[PDB]
Symmetry: C2
Subunit: 213 residues, 2 copies
């Protein structure tokens, strides 16, 4: 429940450069007051990915370490740097949003994950593409993810444990695609040590996106 200490610390932290601040929910203070990200979107497809080569962290209690451990087992969390935990997507041919039960997404394997990452940018639901306008492009997801990556290569302020990337874009017919980080229940001071566990996963994820382009 102490997302608060994070936002308190992070939002005012002037050592984090401004172009990286923009990946984070705007904090208005505190009973907690946060910008809704999806507020500017009309018909948005949205996906949330759990970043991290492991979900746990050494400093967690014993009960919460063994918990995360068995959760990770059999997901793409181990095999790849990350885990697709939910999406919701708009089919243009049927004029409708669909959104699979989240339990079901736990069972995805490496091909499963690549397929789904493509569905995310298809009009179907054989997979088409908005890939060039969501993932690709000079202002798309791949570029944004890269900007993030650069930062994670150097920043030693925070360790983002158990924490998720969020992708979203517009369907209403630009795609206006965006990346954000969410879930800070477990962020810790990375005491002069880069968040390698995240950086690991981020890079893997980046490669998946790049395959597709």
């Amino acid at each position: 429940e102490i997302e608060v200490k994070f936002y308190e610390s992070f939002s005012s932290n002037t050592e984090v450069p401004e172009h990286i601040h923009r990946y984070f929910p705007v904090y208005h203070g505190t009973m907690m007051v946060l910008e809704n990200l999806l507020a500017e979107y009309t018909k948005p497809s949205v996906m949330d990915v759990k970043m991290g080569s492991r979900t746990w962290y050494p400093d967690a209690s014993e009960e919460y370490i063994q918990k995360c451990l068995k959760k990770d087992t059999g997901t793409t969390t181990v095999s790849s740097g990350f885990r697709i935990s939910g999406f919701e997507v708009y089919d243009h041919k049927e004029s409708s949003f669909w959104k699979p039960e989240r339990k079901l997404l736990r069972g995805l394997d490496v091909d499963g994950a690549r397929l789904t990452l493509r569905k995310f940018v298809s009009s179907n639901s054989p997979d088409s593409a908005f890939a060039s306008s969501v993932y690709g492009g000079s202002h798309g997801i791949l570029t944004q993810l890269l900007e993030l990556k650069t930062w994670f290569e150097n920043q030693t302020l925070y360790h983002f444990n158990s924490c998720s990337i969020l992708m979203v874009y517009e369907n209403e017919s630009d795609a206006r695609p965006q990346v954000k980080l969410v879930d800070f229940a477990h962020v810790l001071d990375g005491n002069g040590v880069i968040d390698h566990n995240f950086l690991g996963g981020l890079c893997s994820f980046i490669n998946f996106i790049r395959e597709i382009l």
Copy 2:
């Protein structure tokens, strides 16, 4: 026992750019026959680091996963990308190599590691100096070398380097001719179109420690 199949595969494999091959013991066939790296060094200080946010891997057996899982706990392996497994260094004041027991380094914490990595480039081991600018830094130094590998590890999905060490070495003789290489390929596997994120993570933390030091 199958470093063989890897060498056989890696040494031929034509998808590895050629400026990367130079970070791997040269192979010559087979009872195995491999260029020894240290041959070119008169008085070398050397260090071997276990790369990896974890040591084990999913495809390993159960006995072997629980083994490493315990081994990892309480070492910079989990905290940082990696784990200094051993080194041997040449104090120029006492004209003498020394080299601490391997177990002892298993106890190192983050500050320990940052110190050790700085010892590794000093003339003192008796407050630490620097050959840091000529081993680590410089346009052909370890930093540049570690960076080249990083780039590569961002893209390459050919091999997963399970449970596998980086080796640094350099010349004490009175330049320092610093060099990086990867060793131990008993557990390599086909990265089935998935980068070696575990390694890449480690390498990146490692790259940062060394960058601090400059």
